[PDB]
Amino acid sequence: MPTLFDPIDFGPIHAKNRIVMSPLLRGRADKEAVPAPIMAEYYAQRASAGLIITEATGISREGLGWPFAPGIWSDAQVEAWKPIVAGVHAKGGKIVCQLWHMGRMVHSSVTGTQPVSSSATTAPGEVHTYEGKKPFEQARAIDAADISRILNDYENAARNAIRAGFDGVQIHAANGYLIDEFLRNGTNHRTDEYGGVPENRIRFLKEVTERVIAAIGADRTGVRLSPNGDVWGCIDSAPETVFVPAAKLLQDLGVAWLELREPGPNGDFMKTDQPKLSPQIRKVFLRPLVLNQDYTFEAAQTALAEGKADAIAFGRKFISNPDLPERFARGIALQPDDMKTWFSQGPEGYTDYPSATSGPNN
């Protein structure tokens, strides 16, 4: 029964503590999805985190519709990630790349192709483009040839992640994106082998996970799931019958660790009514389980104290607190984060969050 400050091994990744920086897209790449030098400074400032999970990073032009988000399918993107990773390693940190395919959460003006998903659905609301928000387009239900191509993309992205120096990768199977669209029955209306019974709805996750495992090794393969929230219109009516078996599959496949994002009943951006499945998932996935969402320092210590989690990932607190593990250890109050600069451009609200009384007061 450890504390947040006790080390943990995520496969071969020796993490000096159990404070993980959850994935957080910041939109600081260029229009070619190539990371900008400023991203090296952002990740370096937070290298005291036991493990960094990078922002969602697109596996392909097709799967990346968020403007100014980074990618990892091309040699140019690889060459740009290299000094970003090296700068975290220079401070002794560890960092994994979150491989992204956005599925239907995409706009054809960005990707160049119609949104693709498990079924031909339209997400509610508005999608970002380089020319402002636009209505979501109806998705195309991908076929077997599409799956094979998308599997190739995942492998090449996972291989490129390792080329860039990453200690591992995290498969984004959550948040209503491509894989989550297959997992949940509210969005998977397929009548073939990838829809219907829970085993069928996990088949795409299985095949994605198998390629990544075979590409970079199972000990360097983590996954993120979001079993209970209603994220971007993506929900499953009976999550237990799908997500518990999905986590059992991840165990059987040997994935080194699992992160769960679990909204509660009372939450800002994206909450829910469906209860968390971490206790049930905990019984089937025995390797490091990472829990994430509304965690305070106090609740995070409680989860490790109660054997309910191995580590805790922090998102919004790491935006505004580059030294989050030091404020936890030293009892320092935390900096609030400014939403306006979540997805803006430049260092403002990005690399100018101070760590100590060294700003305009030293």
350 is catalytic: no
Query: Interface with ligand FMN includes 264 (CB under 6 A)?
Result: no
CA dist., res. 356 & res. 189, Å (int) = 52
Q: How far is the CB of 132 from ligand FMN (least distance, A)?
A: 19
Binding mask 224-253 for ligand FMN (x = CB under 6 A): x-----------------------------
Q: Is 51 in the site for ligand FMN (CB under 6 A)?
A: no
By C-alpha distance, which of 13, 42, 15, 20 is closest to 260? 20
- Site size toward ligand FMN, by CB under 6 A: 20
- Tell me the residue nearest to ligand FMN as measured from the CB: 315
| DSSP letter assigned to residue 34 | P
- The percent helix, strand, coil of the chain (3-state, each to 5) is 35, 15, 50
Q: What is the dihedral of CA 109, 111, 113, 116, to 10 degrees?
A: -120
Interface with ligand FMN includes 46 (CB under 6 A)?
no
Cα separation, 174 vs 159, in Å, equals 21
All residues at 6 or more sequence positions from 361 whose CB lies less than 8 Å from its CB, including other chains: none
CB closer to ligand FMN, 32 vs 294? 294
**Encoded tokens for 205:** 């996750």
DSSP character for 4? T
CB of 92 to ligand FMN, least distance (A): 23
**Cβ-based nearer residue to ligand FMN, 90 or 339:** 339
Q: Work out which of 342, 347, 351, 355 binds ligand FMN, going by CB under 6 A.
A: 342
Burial of 357 per CB tally in 10 Å (0-12, 13-18, 19+): exposed
Which is catalytic among the residues 43, 177, 194, 295? 177
Contact 161, 97 (CB under 8 A): yes
Site for ligand FMN contains 23 (CB under 6 A):
yes
Strand partners of residue 130: 132
Tell me how far, at minimum, the Cβ of 205 lies from ligand FMN, in Å: 15
CB of 317 to ligand FMN, least distance (A): 6
Query: From the CB of 176, what's the least distance to ligand FMN, in Å?
Result: 11
Q: Which of 10, 13, 22, 43 binds ligand FMN (CB under 6 A)?
A: 22
According to the binding rule CB under 6 A, does residue 276 interact with ligand FMN?
Answer: no
At its nearest, how many Å lie between ligand FMN and the CB of residue 318? 8
CB of 343 to ligand FMN, least distance (A): 7
> Can you tell me the distance from the alpha carbon of 322 to that of 200, in angstroms, rounded to the nearest whole number?
42
Which tokens go with 32?
Answer: 């070619």
321 binding ligand FMN? (CB under 6 A): no
Q: Which is nearer to ligand FMN, 201 or 261 (CB)?
A: 261
183's tokens: 């997992």
Of 24, 169, 250, 289, the residue at the interface with ligand FMN (CB under 6 A) is 24
Site residues (CB under 6 A) for ligand FMN, limited to 74-133 = 98, 100
Amino acid at position 362, single letter: N
Contacts of 139 (CB under 8 A, 6+ apart): 103, 104, 114, 115, 116, 117, 119, 120, 121, 122, 123
* 341 sits near ligand FMN (criterion: CB under 6 A): no
Q: Within 51-125, where are the H helices?
A: 75-90, 108-111
Distance CA(18)–CA(328), nearest Å, equals 12
Which of the residues 148 through 207 are near ligand FMN (CB under 6 A)? 172, 174-175
Which window, 18-26, 120-128, 303-311, 328-336, contacts ligand FMN (CB under 6 A)?
18-26
Interface with ligand FMN (CB under 6 A): 22-25, 55-56, 98, 100, 172, 174-175, 224, 261, 292-294, 314-316, 342
Enzyme catalytic residues: 177
